[PDB]
Enzyme design. Structure first.
Site, mmCIF file in Angstrom:
data_model
loop_
_atom_site.group_PDB
_atom_site.id
_atom_site.type_symbol
_atom_site.label_atom_id
_atom_site.label_comp_id
_atom_site.label_asym_id
_atom_site.label_seq_id
_atom_site.Cartn_x
_atom_site.Cartn_y
_atom_site.Cartn_z
ATOM 1 C CE1 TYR A 1 32.403 35.228 29.568
ATOM 2 C CE2 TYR A 1 33.836 34.442 27.828
ATOM 3 C CZ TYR A 1 32.730 34.282 28.621
ATOM 4 O OH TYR A 1 31.948 33.145 28.506
ATOM 5 C CB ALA B 1 27.718 29.761 34.096
ATOM 6 C CG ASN C 1 26.514 29.405 37.612
ATOM 7 O OD1 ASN C 1 27.692 29.059 37.649
ATOM 8 N ND2 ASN C 1 26.142 30.637 37.284
ATOM 9 C CB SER D 1 30.202 30.840 28.196
ATOM 10 O OG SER D 1 29.378 31.967 28.280
ATOM 11 C CG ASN E 1 27.360 36.592 26.739
ATOM 12 O OD1 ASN E 1 28.229 35.708 26.760
ATOM 13 N ND2 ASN E 1 26.449 36.727 27.701
ATOM 14 C CD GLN F 1 25.382 40.754 31.993
ATOM 15 O OE1 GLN F 1 25.896 41.882 32.173
ATOM 16 N NE2 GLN F 1 24.906 40.020 32.988
HETATM 17 B B1 LIG Z 1 29.085 32.471 29.673
HETATM 18 O O1 LIG Z 1 28.527 31.201 30.337
HETATM 19 O O2 LIG Z 1 30.370 32.832 30.367
HETATM 20 C C1 LIG Z 1 27.957 33.626 29.517
HETATM 21 N N1 LIG Z 1 27.598 34.079 30.859
HETATM 22 S S1 LIG Z 1 26.074 34.706 30.967
HETATM 23 O O3 LIG Z 1 25.942 35.535 32.220
HETATM 24 O O4 LIG Z 1 25.520 35.359 29.742
HETATM 25 C C2 LIG Z 1 25.075 33.205 31.196
HETATM 26 C C3 LIG Z 1 23.582 33.394 31.254
HETATM 27 C C4 LIG Z 1 22.821 33.461 30.089
HETATM 28 C C5 LIG Z 1 21.436 33.554 30.176
HETATM 29 C C6 LIG Z 1 20.831 33.642 31.434
HETATM 30 C C7 LIG Z 1 19.307 33.696 31.612
HETATM 31 O O5 LIG Z 1 18.552 33.566 30.623
HETATM 32 O O6 LIG Z 1 18.892 33.892 32.775
HETATM 33 C C8 LIG Z 1 21.600 33.509 32.585
HETATM 34 C C9 LIG Z 1 22.985 33.417 32.506
#
Ligand SMILES: *[B]([O])([O])[C][N]S(=O)(=O)[C]C1=[C][C]=C(C([O])=O)[C]=[C]1
EC number: 3.5.2.6
Length: 351
Positions: free
Chosen positions: A147, A308, A333, A61, A149, A117
């Site tokens: 928050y 992360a 992570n 992120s 995505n 998500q």
């Molecule tokens: B950000 O880092 O706050 C978004 N967080 S998240 O849970 O979408 C990060 C993420 C993205 C992709 C995957 C995967 O492909 O396993 C895991 C975690």
């Protein structure tokens, strides 16, 4: 490195790596506008490849800072306005819940509860359309921050629509190239795979998997050198030669909403400097107060973003007023509080 920086960095990061069992880490401190680099451990445990200043990490992120800045650049260009309705750029988005939801709401997670998500089943452009059409807001636009995505991700895809360019192309041409971020990628090319660290989750080597809006929300990979340059650019936007990019950076650090001690920017989040780390959960809904109008980027701020992926943990924070910043990139992570505690310990010492 000046001994002060060497000492605080090593004495802070070494125990961190040990307590969190982090396989590999890179850190950059920007002190009086000059970068200092540090690396530890393994980019690839199996192949015994070390972390170097050229190792690529998944930013997760922290990628949202790039999206927020690219968006700002597009505003500066007059290609989009944050006050524009979302439907102006996606007219197929006809469901009535979308009335009153602006690009500003997308960019700042205030649209009314867009999901953290995008579901995995959402692949095609048609799948995305259906996802957003069927989404039911919990709240009126601009009353709560969640928050997400699927919020800033959509903002990223829409902001580049006028450009005619693909998101990756726009990011390359308008942000990465101008800033000389020549080892920063949305898609890691085969020529660079040698440098692409593995992430580690539960002791298994993992890379991020493709997903809808991945490029926009969490898909950037970068080196500690490039991230240090990203921090420099964000510390001093006025040194940036390209007018709209300089402005885009400034716009991304404006304060659009306040929740508690924090202010929401585009990608970036800010708190007033000074502050203790204590002031600095899968789903966390908070009421927001509009800042009307948004406050221009405040020099005495702690400006930061955590990031992360499954196998990577990243953090970036800087304080414009002190020309000071830090980037922490790790291929595990590990908990955010540990990231913030370490960053604060290092920057506090140097400030
Ligand atoms: B950000 O880092 O706050 C978004 N967080 S998240 O849970 O979408 C990060 C993420 C993205 C992709 C995957 C995967 O492909 O396993 C895991 C975690």
């Amino acid at each position: 490195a000046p001994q002060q920086i060497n000492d605080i960095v090593h004495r802070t990061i070494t125990p961190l790596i040990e307590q969190q069992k982090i396989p590999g880490m890179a850190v950059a401190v920007i002190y009086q506008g000059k970068p200092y680099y540090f690396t530890w451990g393994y980019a690839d445990i199996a192949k015994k490849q070390p972390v170097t200043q050229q190792t690529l990490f998944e930013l997760g992120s922290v990628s949202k800072t790039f999206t927020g800045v690219l968006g700002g650049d597009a505003i500066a260009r007059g290609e989009i306005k944050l006050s524009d309705p979302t439907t102006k750029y996606w007219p197929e988005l006809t469901a009535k819940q979308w009335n009153g939801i602006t690009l500003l709401h997308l960019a700042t997670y205030t649209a009314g509860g867009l999901p953290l998500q995008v579901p995995d089943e959402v692949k095609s452009s048609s799948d995305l359309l259906r996802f957003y059409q069927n989404w039911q807001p919990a709240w009126a636009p601009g009353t709560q921050r969640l928050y997400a995505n699927s919020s800033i991700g959509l903002f990223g895809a829409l902001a580049v629509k006028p450009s005619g360019l693909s998101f990756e192309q726009a990011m390359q041409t308008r942000v990465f190239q101008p800033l000389k971020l020549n080892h920063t990628w949305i898609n890691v090319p085969p020529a660079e795979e040698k440098n692409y660290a593995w992430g580690y989750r539960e002791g298994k080597a993992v890379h991020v998997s493709p997903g809808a809006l991945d490029a926009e929300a969490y898909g950037v990979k970068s080196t500690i050198e490039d991230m240090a340059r990203w921090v420099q650019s964000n510390l001093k936007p006025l040194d940036i030669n390209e007018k709209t990019l300089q402005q885009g950076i400034q716009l991304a650090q404006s304060r659009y909403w306040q929740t508690g001690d924090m202010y929401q920017g585009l990608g970036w989040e800010m708190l007033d400097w000074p502050v203790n780390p204590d002031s600095i959960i899968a789903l966390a809904a908070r009421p927001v107060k509009a800042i009307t109008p948004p406050t221009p980027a405040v020099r005495a701020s702690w400006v930061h973003k955590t990031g992360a992926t499954g196998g990577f943990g990243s953090y970036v924070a800087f304080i414009p007023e002190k020309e000071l910043g830090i980037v922490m990139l790790a291929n595990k992570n590990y908990p955010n509080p540990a990231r913030v505690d370490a960053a604060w310990q290092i920057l506090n010492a140097l400030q």
